[PDB]
Design a protein around this ligand. Structure first.
Ligand SMILES: Nc1ncnc2c1ncn2[C@@H]1O[C@H](COP(=O)(O)OP(=O)(O)O)[C@@H](O)[C@H]1O
Ligand SMILES: Nc1ncnc2c1ncn2[C@@H]1O[C@H](COP(=O)(O)OP(=O)(O)O)[C@@H](O)[C@H]1O
Ligand SMILES: CC(=O)c1cc(C(=O)NOCCO)c(Nc2ccc(I)cc2F)n1C
Ligand SMILES: CC(=O)c1cc(C(=O)NOCCO)c(Nc2ccc(I)cc2F)n1C
Ligand SMILES: [Mg+2]
Ligand SMILES: [Mg+2]
Lengths: 290, 290
């Protein structure tokens, strides 16, 4: 059935980002609980219908590694995207309560991300464009899913006008120009894993003594770091050599030398995590409360 | 009297920016029309009261060059700032309808900005922090006023997390570090004048043949331009030498060599515009429709 504005009832607020709020809502006719994302945009009636028309491809996105989609519509200067509600939140929320995410678990996250990026590329011919912890959602039945990928050419456009002014997960090639594509997503995933592995955004890298301690930067300064300085590493010693090398392979500045989806899929760290009997479900509740 | 949420009625939307919507509203008990800015923030009950308490100094800001303030309060995860409604909008809106703002008029804008920055510094000991066309508001009775300056230390904090991802009006010293202060505002004003003088954001500078034509950039690319490349100039010929030199004085990369408020106040371009009988009121309506 068709989703429309009067059929919803607000339950609570799941969070906000740039120009978009996300509500936990009830779809009154179906009884279903959904997450409803609202994007406020000053756009003509014609292009909005393009946006909505381009958003319909989400109905064709069906993967255990991709957040479920219910439908998209336009309401009060708002574009609504209605998704499956992930009771576990995003991994940045999870990191905030957990402090640091264990390697074995990052192993599972990494598999879900690679499998999701692969799905989008193979079946839909698109890159993600916004891989970061907050766009990796998890739930109580143990599933790990990507959200907030760019399906709509026109929506990518009307949203060009702003980005997160502190942390960037953008690849050095994307920070410098047009010359980027899918390899860019590898960089963001790599950076996200380091953040989650370590307990904080990894640029600038942890101080010599700040390292065995665990175990405010300016806009240009930060970006100039990503572009011109050696990429972040996992600290030597407390992570397996295979993990260290996997993120090393992800964080290579040159996008052609950097590893791609098909090489990471057969990487030692994945082969290994793919074998492991890990109770992701049980871990997520033990750490957050479900 | 005290402003509160149920005493308001929405009239229309004046616009939006980062995390903040602005409504044209009616204050039902007084009958007054106001602009009401809402800032949505995930913040504890204690710091919010600090924010509100810090916002009260706006009651003490009374200058014909500073947008009027009615009051500030907290409502539904929203911080409300209620201001005088400026029926002329901001100068970016004005530029959009006008295409290009005449020199004589920029003369008046420049005087209003300098006089407003001076007021804030002399009487309140604060810098603006966000000088740009959209924070210069104008009205039908011909007044030119600054808005959106940082009065609240704590609010500056909870708002650190995002900035405009395309155009920056930030000074090179502010893009590179903590080492900035009031001189930074001079840079932004300078850049704003060039934009308004010329009809578009002046970085990168107009192409050789794109110049007598009038008469898509990446994040790092743009910032790297502001920091490492020569500052934008007005085109030679169609602006007075005095204007060209005034913005030159504003756009000096070194903040100590750059001109300050007291030097610009006695600059040839100001001395001259200060004499001129300019019908700003009449111009603003002739161009926008009042
Ligand atoms: N489908 C969902 N289920 C549960 N929580 C969600 C969902 N989508 C978004 N959220 C939460 O709402 C927050 C706001 O998301 P968004 O507007 O996409 O901002 P961000 O830039 O943080 O991704 C996200 O950080 C996430 O915590
Ligand atoms: N007091 C006001 N009177 C009339 N219009 C206003 C007022 N304040 C803001 N606006 C309009 O609302 C828009 C949204 O403003 P804001 O949230 O401060 O975003 P910006 O970053 O564009 O300044 C502004 O661009 C301006 O056009
Ligand atoms: C570009 C495009 O197609 C697009 C961009 C975004 C997005 O949510 N960006 O978030 C920024 C918040 O600050 C988006 N949303 C989106 C995409 C897939 C799914 I499953 C859920 C979603 F909400 N789309 C479908
Ligand atoms: C920091 C601080 O004190 C502060 C920051 C801002 C602000 O509006 N920023 O806008 C960003 C929108 O994207 C703000 N607002 C503000 C300040 C003065 C006046 I007169 C009206 C206002 F709405 N204050 C009072
Ligand atoms: Mg998101
Ligand atoms: Mg503003």
């Amino acid at each position: 059935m068709e989703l429309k504005d009067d059929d919803f009832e607000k339950i609570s607020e799941l969070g906000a980002g740039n120009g978009g709020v996300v509500f936990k809502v009830s779809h009154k006719p179906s009884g279903l609980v959904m997450a409803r994302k609202l994007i406020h945009l000053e756009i003509k009636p014609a292009i909005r219908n393009q946006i909505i028309r381009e958003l319909q491809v989400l109905h064709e996105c069906n993967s255990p590694y991709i957040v479920g989609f219910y439908g998209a519509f336009y309401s009060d200067g708002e574009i609504s995207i209605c998704m499956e509600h992930m009771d576990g939140g995003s991994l940045d929320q999870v990191l905030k309560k957990a402090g640091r995410i264990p390697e074995q678990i990052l192993g599972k996250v990494s598999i879900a991300v690679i499998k999701g990026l692969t799905y989008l590329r193979e079946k839909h011919k698109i890159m993600h464009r916004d891989v970061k912890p907050s766009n990796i959602l998890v739930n109580s039945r143990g599933e790990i899913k990507l959200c907030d990928f760019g399906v709509s050419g026109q929506l990518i456009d009307s949203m060009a006008n702003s980005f997160v002014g502190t942390r960037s997960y953008m690849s050095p090639e994307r920070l410098q120009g047009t010359h980027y594509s899918v390899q860019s997503d590898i960089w963001s995933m790599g950076l996200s894993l380091v953040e989650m592995a370590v307990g904080r955004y990894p640029i600038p890298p942890p101080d010599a003594k700040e390292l065995e301690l665990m175990f405010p930067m300016a806009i240009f300064e930060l970006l100039d770091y990503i572009v011109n300085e050696p990429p972040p590493k996992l600290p030597s010693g407390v992570f397996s050599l295979e993990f260290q090398d996997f993120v090393n392979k992800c964080l290579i500045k040159n996008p052609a030398e950097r590893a791609d989806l098909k090489q990471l899929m057969v990487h030692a760290f994945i082969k290994r995590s793919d074998a492991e009997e890990v109770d992701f479900a049980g871990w997520l509740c033990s750490t957050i409360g479900l």
